[PDB]
Design an enzyme around this catalytic site. Structure first.
Site, PDB file in Angstrom:
ATOM      1  N   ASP A 642       0.837  -1.189   0.000  1.00  0.00           N
ATOM      2  CA  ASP A 642       0.000   0.000   0.000  1.00  0.00           C
ATOM      3  C   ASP A 642       0.876   1.244   0.000  1.00  0.00           C
ATOM      4  O   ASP A 642       2.018   1.220   0.463  1.00  0.00           O
ATOM      5  CB  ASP A 642      -0.940   0.022   1.214  1.00  0.00           C
ATOM      6  CG  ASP A 642      -1.883   1.208   1.202  1.00  0.00           C
ATOM      7  OD1 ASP A 642      -2.059   1.819   0.126  1.00  0.00           O
ATOM      8  OD2 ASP A 642      -2.450   1.530   2.267  1.00  0.00           O
ATOM      9  N   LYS A 711      -4.246   8.416  11.331  1.00  0.00           N
ATOM     10  CA  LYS A 711      -4.454   7.742  10.055  1.00  0.00           C
ATOM     11  C   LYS A 711      -5.936   7.681   9.714  1.00  0.00           C
ATOM     12  O   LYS A 711      -6.335   7.942   8.573  1.00  0.00           O
ATOM     13  CB  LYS A 711      -3.849   6.336  10.109  1.00  0.00           C
ATOM     14  CG  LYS A 711      -4.092   5.477   8.867  1.00  0.00           C
ATOM     15  CD  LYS A 711      -4.235   4.003   9.226  1.00  0.00           C
ATOM     16  CE  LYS A 711      -2.884   3.347   9.464  1.00  0.00           C
ATOM     17  NZ  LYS A 711      -2.085   3.236   8.213  1.00  0.00           N
ATOM     18  N   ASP A 842      -7.908  -0.971  -0.992  1.00  0.00           N
ATOM     19  CA  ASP A 842      -6.810  -0.030  -1.201  1.00  0.00           C
ATOM     20  C   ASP A 842      -5.445  -0.644  -0.909  1.00  0.00           C
ATOM     21  O   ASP A 842      -4.472   0.082  -0.685  1.00  0.00           O
ATOM     22  CB  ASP A 842      -7.004   1.232  -0.352  1.00  0.00           C
ATOM     23  CG  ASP A 842      -8.387   1.834  -0.510  1.00  0.00           C
ATOM     24  OD1 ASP A 842      -9.208   1.252  -1.250  1.00  0.00           O
ATOM     25  OD2 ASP A 842      -8.652   2.887   0.106  1.00  0.00           O
TER      26      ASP A 842
END
Ligand SMILES: C[C@@H](Oc1ccc2c(-c3ccc(F)cc3Cl)cc(=O)oc2c1)C(=O)N1CCC[C@@H](C(=O)O)C1
Length: 911
Positions: A642, A711, A842
């Site tokens: 990622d 995050k 993702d």
């Protein structure tokens, strides 16, 4: 309305082969004056086509005479039906030529018939046979080669010059055919029974008596529903014969057995709390329509043709089988030839109401009815108590919800693809689905081919459940659960019910590989079709699944596996790859202990961020290092990669901001930089300042701000517009580790989101500028009374279903589409290069051996995507579409100074 009902009735009579009843009803309509006007040339042509397919020339001439008496002119459809009947009965060339001469006199053309009239292959063949008897030299224009898109991005993808080495499924052709047959049988059954993974006590005092009495009640209900259905069908038959329109052919469309079985299944699946009456009627009507579609595909030979084509199409995927020329699955399907109408809303509504009332009537129990009117059909308290006492371990699922056991059908069009006998749309969204589909149909077909091939690639991937992890999760779930590790324990009751459905399906798929068909959203983010696979972000689900096909680790396979294990543990996030590998080698003893004795031991994995994924990686590295040659060991584990906030990455790439590129690690660097940690420090400074100023939220929220919350907040600000992963999940993350009072959790989340947004605005100048520009553009386009629409870099059109929400969602949606296009490009290039690539929330999953190649392709495709004038093309499209608005669109944000090529050199771009 009545004309629509009559058209649907005639079409259903054609489908059911009730031409006598259709003819009777049409004759009554024509004989009655006021009803003659309600008829239509469409209904006349439908009855004519039915009589032609059945081969009744006398009846066809009678219908033509009635048409002429009704002051209607024969049309292409009527002439097609006439020619079909003539060819079926081998009519004389004289009559054929006379009919053709009459048609030409009417001004119609022979070549336009095959193009404007919708007919099946058999009808077309019969019409051609009829025509050739008079004009033997009449041949339809030869089909042209299929068009291939040649976009600046997909040019290298679809170019024949570029060499290719696509992957091939490990299963042989014969096993693939057997799995296809299994899937076909299951889809025809339409329901699957799975054994529950809950410990059965198996008592005899209550459970057995409950089960036996429930069996008796089920038999009574079935034999009452059969009688009710037969009586209703006879009533509707008499009604139609009297002259009035009814639902007789709609009832006869589905077998009485199927109707009663679906009714009983719906009654069994009825929730205890109750369900709405209108919702139940809608569900019944939709189920009837779908089962009719499937049984029609079966009886009409469409299933046989699909099997004949699939047996050939599997030669491309099968390893032993080799096709003449390598090409994509969709291309091969189209080359071989792909085989080729919702009911009215009022008709569906009446059918659903009839079925639901029939159920409520025939449902009797020791006799008091079962369903009561609270329009809410709540079950009987005694009935639900009896069902609970019985506690049947078997659970019923739909054939579409269960993952397929055969390669999904390539996505040839927005409608054709994925499931076999079930129609699957390209976009899952039901809000504005009509708009999305009409736009996808209007735009050039070559445009969507890229996305369709990307979805076919993402779907054609084999998966299997990991036996050890599944057994461990089941042992924990049955043994009172373990919330710490994530396994639910007996709100929580709902979480346990859901987990039971997923784990039960996992046990079903223990020893069989499956495939996950993927659809899209209006934003462009791909999602698996099965609804049970929605929770793919959970560590449990992430550890359960594994690529059925496994590849040799190779030279750097073990190193990549260790680095992935370290990333999962999260102990060393700021350290580079070399130090991560060093730490992995250091904790090798604990890794091996965890791999050997997970439940009883040091439980090192338990002290990790993702415990189940960490345990799986420990098992994998153990099995790899225990073999004679670690490189020879075959890995089946998905390695995830990622990019730290892909949204901010795309923002910085568009803005060419050097500071932003260095923050989100776009620029080469020996040590990785945490934009999350930077924003954490910024929000901490802001909190301190606001606390000195006098803000209770900032004063109390002291020190609790952590990398996880930061995050989540960045994901909500950059990738969140009130969607999954936003402020609600921020509040959840905060509460989970909340030592401060929970009374102001909502206000604390609001303040944190605001401060993180302001910090991002202050830091990323390019992000700020681009976001402001997109926000103003969306605001103006909404003020002009229009919905924001654009086209992704690939060519897929995108529209907002929201009907300010548009203002707040346009930048996130654009970033989502950019990320989706990047992922599609990466997946297509990996497929060309012979790599197994998938996108799961993702995070790009591949094999431990091809991680370097995947990262290289990702960097290259990212640079290729962001090298084009994305913002300029967006502005030009917006102007051409919606034309002070033009002034703002022309004022594209000024690009910064940054050599985007540097991304190719960045080794920490994706980690
Ligand atoms: C507790 C958690 O275990 C699971 C287990 C399996 C799955 C599967 C799945 C299904 C069939 C199969 F053959 C293999 C797999 Cl892997 C798919 C999936 O998508 O999810 C799963 C989750 C769970 O069911 N959850 C639901 C509620 C919210 C989630 C959360 O933690 O927020 C947890």
């Amino acid at each position: 309305g009545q004309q629509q009902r009559l058209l649907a009735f005639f079409k259903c009579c054609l489908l059911t082969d009730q031409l006598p009843l259709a003819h009777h009803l049409l004759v009554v309509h024509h004989g009655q004056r006021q009803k003659r006007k309600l008829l239509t040339l469409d209904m006349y042509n439908a009855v004519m086509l039915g009589w032609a397919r059945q081969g009744a020339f006398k009846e066809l001439v009678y219908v033509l005479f009635m048409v002429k008496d009704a002051g209607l002119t024969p049309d292409l459809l009527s002439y097609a039906a006439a020619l079909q009947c003539m060819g079926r009965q081998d009519q004389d060339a004289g009559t054929i030529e006379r009919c053709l001469e009459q048609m030409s006199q009417e001004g119609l053309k022979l070549q336009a018939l095959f193009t404007a009239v919708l007919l099946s292959e058999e009808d077309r063949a019969t019409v051609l046979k009829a025509v050739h008897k008079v004009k033997p030299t009449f041949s339809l224009p030869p089909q042209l080669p299929p068009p291939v898109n040649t976009s600046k991005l997909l040019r290298d993808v679809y170019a024949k010059d570029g060499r290719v080495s696509y992957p091939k499924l490990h299963l042989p052709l014969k096993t693939l055919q057997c799995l296809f047959e299994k899937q076909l049988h299951m889809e025809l059954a339409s329901r699957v029974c799975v054994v529950s993974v809950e410990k059965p006590t198996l008592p005899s005092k209550e459970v057995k008596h409950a089960r036996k009495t429930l069996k008796t009640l089920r038999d009574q209900w079935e034999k009452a529903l059969c009688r009710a259905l037969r009586e209703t069908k006879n009533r509707l038959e008499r009604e139609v014969y009297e002259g009035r329109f009814s639902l007789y052919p709609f009832l006869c469309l589905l077998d009485e057995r199927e109707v009663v079985r679906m009714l009983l299944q719906v009654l069994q699946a009825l929730p205890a709390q109750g369900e709405s009456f209108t919702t139940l009627a809608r569900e019944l009507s939709a189920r009837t329509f779908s089962r009719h579609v499937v049984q029609r595909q079966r009886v009409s030979g469409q299933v046989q043709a699909l099997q004949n084509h699939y047996r050939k199409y599997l030669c491309l995927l099968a390893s032993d089988a080799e096709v003449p020329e390598p090409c994509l699955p969709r291309q091969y399907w189209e080359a071989l030839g792909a085989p080729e109408q919702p009911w009215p809303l009022p008709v569906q509504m009446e059918l659903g109401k009839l079925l639901a009332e029939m159920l409520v009537q025939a449902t009797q129990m020791p006799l008091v009815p079962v369903l009561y009117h609270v329009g809410i059909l709540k079950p009987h308290p005694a009935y639900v108590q009896l069902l609970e006492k019985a506690a049947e371990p078997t659970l019923t699922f739909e054939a579409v919800d269960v993952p397929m056991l055969c390669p999904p059908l390539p996505w040839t069009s927005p409608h054709s693809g994925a499931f076999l006998l079930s129609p699957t749309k390209l976009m899952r969204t039901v809000e504005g689905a009509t708009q999305h589909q009409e736009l996808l149909e209007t735009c050039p077909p070559t445009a969507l081919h890229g996305a369709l091939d990307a979805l076919t690639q993402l779907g054609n991937c084999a998966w299997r459940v990991n036996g050890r992890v599944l057994d461990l999760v089941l042992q924990l779930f049955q043994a009172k659960g373990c919330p710490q590790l994530g396994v639910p324990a007996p709100e929580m009751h709902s979480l346990r019910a859901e987990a039971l459905y997923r784990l039960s399906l996992a046990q079903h798929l223990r020893d069989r590989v499956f495939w996950l068909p993927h659809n899209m959203d209006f934003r462009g983010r791909t999602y698996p079709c099965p609804p049970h696979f929605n929770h793919l972000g959970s560590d449990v689900a992430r550890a359960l699944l594994e690529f059925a096909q496994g590849r040799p680790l190779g030279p750097h396979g073990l190193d990549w596996l260790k680095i992935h294990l370290v990333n999962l543990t999260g102990l060393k996030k700021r350290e580079p790859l070399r130090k991560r590998l060093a730490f992995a080698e250091e904790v090798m003893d604990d890794i091996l202990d965890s791999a050997d004795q997970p439940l009883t031991g040091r439980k090192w994995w338990m002290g990790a961020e993702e415990p189940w994924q960490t345990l799986a990686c420990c098992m994998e590295v153990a099995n790899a290092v225990r073999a004679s040659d670690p490189a020879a060991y075959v890995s089946h584990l998905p390695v995830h990669q990622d990019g730290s906030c892909n949204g901010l990455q795309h923002y910085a790439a568009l803005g060419r901001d050097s500071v932003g590129a260095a923050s989100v690690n776009l620029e080469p660097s020996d040590v990785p930089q945490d934009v999350y940690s930077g924003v954490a420090a910024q929000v901490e400074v802001f909190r301190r300042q606001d606390a000195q100023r006098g803000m209770r939220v900032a004063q109390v929220l002291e020190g609790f701000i952590t990398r996880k919350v930061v995050k989540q907040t960045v994901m909500t600000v950059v990738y969140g517009v009130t969607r999954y992963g936003g402020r609600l999940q921020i509040e959840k993350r905060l509460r989970e580790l909340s030592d401060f009072p929970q009374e102001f959790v909502w206000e604390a989340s609001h303040y944190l989101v605001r401060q993180v947004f302001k910090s991002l605005q202050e830091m990323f100048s390019g992000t700020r500028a681009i976001q402001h520009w997109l926000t103003e553009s969306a605001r103006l386009i909404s003020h002009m009374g229009s919905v924001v629409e654009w086209v992704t870099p690939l060519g897929v059109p995108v529209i907002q279903p929201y009907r300010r929400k548009q203002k707040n969602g346009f930048p996130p949606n654009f970033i989502h589409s950019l990320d989706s296009s990047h992922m599609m490009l990466t997946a297509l290039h990996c497929y060309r290069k012979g790599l197994t690539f998938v996108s799961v929330h993702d995070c790009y999953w591949t094999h431990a051996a091809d991680v370097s190649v995947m990262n290289q392709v990702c960097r290259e495709q990212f640079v290729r995507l962001h090298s084009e004038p994305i913002l300029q093309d967006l502005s030009r499209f917006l102007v051409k579409r919606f034309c002070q608005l033009k002034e703002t669109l022309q004022a594209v944000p000024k690009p910064g100074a940054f050599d985007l090529e540097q991304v190719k050199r960045s080794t920490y771009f994706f980690s």
